[model samples]
Target: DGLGAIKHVVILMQENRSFDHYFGTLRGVRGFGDRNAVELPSGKPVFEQPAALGTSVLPFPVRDAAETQKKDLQYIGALDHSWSGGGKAWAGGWMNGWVSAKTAATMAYYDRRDIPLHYELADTFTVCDAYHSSIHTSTSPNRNHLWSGKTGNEPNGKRAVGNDAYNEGTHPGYDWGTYAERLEKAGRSWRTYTEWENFTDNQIEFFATFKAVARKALAKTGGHTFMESFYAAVRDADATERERLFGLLEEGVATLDKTERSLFERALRRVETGTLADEFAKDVAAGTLPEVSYLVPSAVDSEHPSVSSPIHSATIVYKVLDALGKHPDVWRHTAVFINYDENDGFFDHVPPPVASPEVTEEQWEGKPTGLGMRVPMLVVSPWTIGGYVCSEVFDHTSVVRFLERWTGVAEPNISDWRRTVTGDLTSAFDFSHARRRPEVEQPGAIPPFSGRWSPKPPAVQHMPVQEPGARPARALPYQPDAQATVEDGAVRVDLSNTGRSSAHFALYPYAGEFPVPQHRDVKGTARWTVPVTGAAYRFTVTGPNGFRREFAGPAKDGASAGAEVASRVDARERDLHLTLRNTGRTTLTFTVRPLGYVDEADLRDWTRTVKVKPGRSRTVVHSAADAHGWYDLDVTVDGDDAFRRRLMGHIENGRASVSGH
Candidate 1:
């Protein structure tokens, strides 16, 4: 695995765009290369979509999308990508439902002239032509898969679909967990560099872990903490740890950069036009970027066709690349993966592949079993340069799998389907040699859209709109969400239980993740036979306004069975300068112990001696033998409980240590 050469994985998941929708006209990698002559039931080629009442329509060049006032073609209207809409568009494998499900505009596409930044990226980096959205549906569910590997579907008909109105208090199911939480669970550093708290796409806000951080922020700052506490978890801080750190943040003992505007003039001027806040740039310059990063662009910069001008959307991406290039030290060891959440109702000609029960197990009835239409993905790294096309199939979970392998964190929540089919993304990099961050000419300035434009920019594009929701997501199904079995050709699940409905289920880590959403009324039902195959499906039964009981389990044609109501389940520098201050009037002898390393070899090689004169501070060095760059360290002085503190250490070429400022 090329994981050795890489230290940071920066992911920028932009909004809806299909591979053909954006890059089909570009040369190489299945771009219109295939005539796509597969005939539809109507005898017209699937690629030839039915137009208004008569003549068949073909994909058209909307090279005019960059225009501010071009009639009809200025902004592509948003189309249907709901569960039913996605399935209908899938068109039972014909792949011709696009025009019929929505409109002839489904065939609209942009070329290099329309989106030069992305075309430049695709031409300069490795493009994955076979990449697809994880779920066949809309944004949130596919995003759910990207974050946690499973689509956020309860046994109820309610699956995470449609853009969440986070301000409206409805929470997507956050119970399965996200890859970031998994990274934190394994003691790895990760950060979600985002536009702001109100980004409808800031999935981190719903993490049960973040819920803890937010409550702390609200209670203390009376909600004025902005996003500081939520991101404190980026440093791998837990609830109590983050709570303790917030006081330092407010008191200026720590950095207060969650949403602070940039001081750099160029960056400052851009921020007024919906550019990303300077938090990420600051982190990059400070070398504090986490091992993994998920950067959700502000809606205005996300390049969602209908939401913002594609020309304007290129700015944030350009700045990010520029920032990384400016900080070559950080960029040298980083790999940035750019992918889309879903196709967002645009067209891609490839017939999506559906997973078998051997992997995916089961899916909602009448739903496309996934590997949605192709969405463009680019592997941007030193090794991935030179514009190669990687044809190995990948979906969003590939990043999840790659992160697991990179951080040594195993996420059981990732479905077998994803595990079986997804490539870990290392395929795009060649570890034999590396290249420096290339010179990127900044994208041309496209003035922010005004009221006359078709682009509405999704409200207050200049600032965040929704406040973090205090309302929790609904709870996971009771005891076992349901008992399942494959009877005849379908899966059967039974739900019944009252006593164990709510048992204070581990309060601190379990709040806020359980908010009320649409659900099925179980009404004390016993069994439901759904035409699908899977192990452990969760059904949330609502007595409506009163109580919702959750349950889960699985079985195989009387061959397998699950018991009813059963449930199961640091940066340490290799070389560090330690500064010890002896403010006392006497000399001090200090002992150092670096603890908590996965390998004892890492723990075995730390400096244990330190000395400091009265009213003076002494600095020393410590190192780790293991290749891994993170560790936990503590020091003690002759005075018990004196001068002992924990510091995060990462072994790097530069020497760094911290003491009383």
Candidate 2:
């Protein structure tokens, strides 16, 4: 089984802690115990302590269950606790340690596990222990390494200026550039699924197209280049700076001024359906696989969230795995390597292996800083023997090497296997077993999501408007209505023309699409769709015309393919808050469709929805749900439509709340 049989390589990277921290105590594992197995001052007995801290628990804050549960926690829970959190109440279980060095040692321990597995799947799955993260420490650089195989050191992480910038410039070592070039020379097809705005790879067009559909055609999709702008804006110093960044939502990107859906949602929706991977897998199955495939999750759910939480991160990884697992035809011949971009500055016990061309370093500020911190990496494939471990000591560049061998493409930099005798990890695999490998199963649907809630809707405001050449005109304010639920996941908006003139109910546009826009006579109800994924859903709404209102609640027993309903209530007045509720537990990603508005830029005002847990109620507010205006909505859990639709409508002046519609 030479490289020819291997058709795909999927990389999945989880967050925080290390291999030893999580699997340190697994059978056949050693090196984590203390000399005497006695409980040390820092707590558990472990022979190797991080270099600086005598114990493994020195670098982090004390773990508190109450607080941890209160705030969405990240990279803080122990592996055992993480897997069994529904039962255990411990704080920072496996993640607890005294020093970064100790964490590294634990990571090394897991790396060894890579050997047996790699050896078994030697024909297909190869684990390169030789591979270390680019930055000896940190997530960003490691991530950069994953994408371009070049640490940001050459130009430094400061201002984007210097020759290093040009060298690593979006396509460092031409890793991506080279791969794309090969595909083109060979007349191959490829695509990339990402959650942000920047196009570091060659699949920018795919991103743009998928983004448009999720944003414009359906309001449920978003999360792309636009989210990057939002982060940049929020990082600004003042309102003016922030406002300018926010303003990009409507002016910066293509057809920005006319799109209504958020860029962020667009990216997220694309991922939910396996946009790029599906294509790559289909091609692989047909024996026409592209040379490379990159799968990126959504922003808020990815590693670079404005906030962090280990549980949420884990779920995200599981989701990605679910996506990959769903396609067995692709997994059989594919090797998926999931890795973290960089260490989140968490501690690691092992000092990274001596920086070699295998794990190359670039000059930075007159000094060479080898890659970012060590982040965890996982290698999965039919070729991967269950429970195999490798401790060869490699870095991101090794990945480039692995790819070079599989594709027979030229390495673009010092990290290439061509530069070192032991750089290549081809030995890890035993190609003989390729023909006997079992077919891997793709991920199946998980249980419906359930969770609790806290409602908070933003105030509604109707500003004056001005046509191309007309002076500013008074804007008709939106009226308030009770929220509805579960109209087969459809949202119905009831607009009544009280004025003598017939007013047009114009749908605003954003991100090159219309979320929801329709008109009715003085009094009528218009139904739209709600794209939801998960067991539970939540969002907020505000209405002030007939009456001001707000409301939030939960629905249970919802199914994604069958008939079910979601519920909501008005915020301005007191009324029946929920119209429908579903108890089915399924995770689905909904498209963001804002009615009466269809512009990509204006889409920023729309909030993307996610069901955190099943059976748990999460209060949704107007600002939180990212909707502004009076609306009566109906939710049909797992409704029937080309795309499953959840509906809603506008009620007259009042707030409402309900549980089981």
Candidate 3:
């Protein structure tokens, strides 16, 4: 049960790097020693050289400047390195097509001098020398392969269709099933943290578009009230708005106008979210990291040539490790997997191995299931053997295999092609030994490049706009109409069914302890009400044949308060003050929780409680030493209602405050 020793698995997947591109010169590993040159189309041969030497054979290195911008098309070059050109680049295992397929600059490699932090991490922990990208091509397929075992292979003697484009329109259906679904089924907590926007945001944007279409359709049909109500609700919708929207869909999509039904149908198909970076920092500080987490770097930190730099990317890793190391409990049971999406037309010495049959026989225009180019994989964990080089052959699927093994979730029972032939990543760890946590050294911050190197927007592929009088092609699916309403001091959940055998509902209260969640059986159209406990709750309804949907509510009405809080530590005054304002109709009680290095002498009085009258403000002050560091002030309001907000600030010589209201 050594695997049980791990409580958190964090995966940080960067973009566009090859093994030789970054770690080619590292010591004691399968890297470029000599005889690593590639023969060009001409009789001449080109060897890897410093990025600074810009030549026709070797363009300027990506590291010579703060920003090196490379677009998706550039990564997917004309022939030698394009998705269709991978087999030719491999040249039946010669692995010598880099120079012929790409420019010398594309074939350039970096060493420890360029990426000291990455080298230090590799030297400090374990590096997988034989790791490869799952696909031989671009970012989308490889990323899809990492999330699911397969990238939409139909087995009809055609190339597997995955993400051919970078946009929401190209998002794959859930027929293959993702790790998120498995994690949900296992009742395990996981989160995807993003620097700017994640997949969930794209899905929401799609939903917004669908809603706009629906509005246009409704207006043509003279349904102005519904359109107005829907637009207004969406404009100020929070979690409450989402729940209500879902309720409306379940309750009446079948009865709605054609355009309305189509809108809800598409909306329900894609609903997901991720915590942003600011929230991630707050969660880490609060020791609330999820069990399985995925961290996505911003564009500048992605290290993609032409748009990003290695230094900025390293800074992101450095900050993450530094934060993790600051907390003993978190670092002890955590393992961080650092990897790249694909090679991005870079030079790699190793030829991809055939881990499956997809690549053995030509499926798509003679393209086989690819174990793409070699990419660097680093394992950082307390139990990982230090400075060890693992030679086990692996691909992106290995990561999924490891997660399935660790979580005991059955491998996705989709197609056999979805399974990894490369075994689980158990070879990367030595869990039998005692834990030896490594000290994470902080890396210097590299400011983002000041250039307009933003990612290219995907070409807009417009879905046919619904005609004013056109009807939906198909009838909406039969789903229950469930809504939660507060009536007469009690919370009521009403379910309207087309036809029901039996229904099970579980209510989860958001605040204050309640009875254990127990399923209650119901039939046909029914309403269940519970006495109001002055707390918010979530309700899940499961109908006959395992049709399940979740709704948030059992809305509570009480004295609500809006809060404005500010915290400042002044070096000259040697004091910390937390001011709170109550913009509500009733009196409010406040609880303040001081976070971060509070054990330091100056922050011992970190917790306090105060009462404020309606429309009044209160301030709490404390003496502090002139220490320089970051801390968080969490303010909670408890009374007839409950609300919480956290403020992050840095105290330099005891003088700093968090930004924003």
lDDT tens string, model 2, 1-661? 3677776665545444443333333232211321112122233333323344442222122122224345222323222111122011111112223333223212222221222221232212333322355543334344444444444333233411122221221322211233433443454444455533232221222222333432333221233232332443344437786455445443434343332223223222232222343444455557654446556654333443233333344445554544555556665677767665544333333333222222234433322244333344556665545333343334666676687677666556434321331244443454545533443322233323233211111122111111111111112223322333443333333433332222223221111122221112222334333334333333322111112112122223423432223334443442223322223455443333333212467654553354423343333333212223233222322232332322333332312211000
**Lowest summed lDDT window (length 10), candidate 3:** 466-475
lDDT of 3 by residue, 95-195 (tens): 44554565444555566656788888877887877688887877666776666665654334335444432333332223455565567557777766653
Model 2: residues >4 Å from true position, as ranges?
Answer: 14-17, 29-130, 152-188, 196-227, 230-289, 303-328, 356-368, 371-373, 415-422, 435-661
Judged by lDDT, which candidate is best?
1
For TM-score, the strongest prediction is: 1
Q: 509, model 2: CA deviation in Å?
A: 67
Q: How would you order the candidates by lDDT, starting with the best?
A: 1, 3, 2
- How would you encode candidate 1's per-residue C-alpha lDDT over 355-422 as one tens digit per residue? 53333353556454557888989888887876666654578888888887777787777765556445
Question: Once model 1 is optimally superposed onto the true structure by TM-score, how far is the C-alpha of residue 347 displaced, in angstroms?
Answer: 1.1
Q: Rank the candidates by TM-score, best first.
A: 1, 3, 2
Alpha-carbon local distance difference test for all models: 0.55, 0.35, 0.54
Which has the higher TM-score value, candidate number 1 or candidate number 3?
Answer: 1
Clashes of 3: 13
Models 1 onward score TM values of: 0.60, 0.42, 0.52
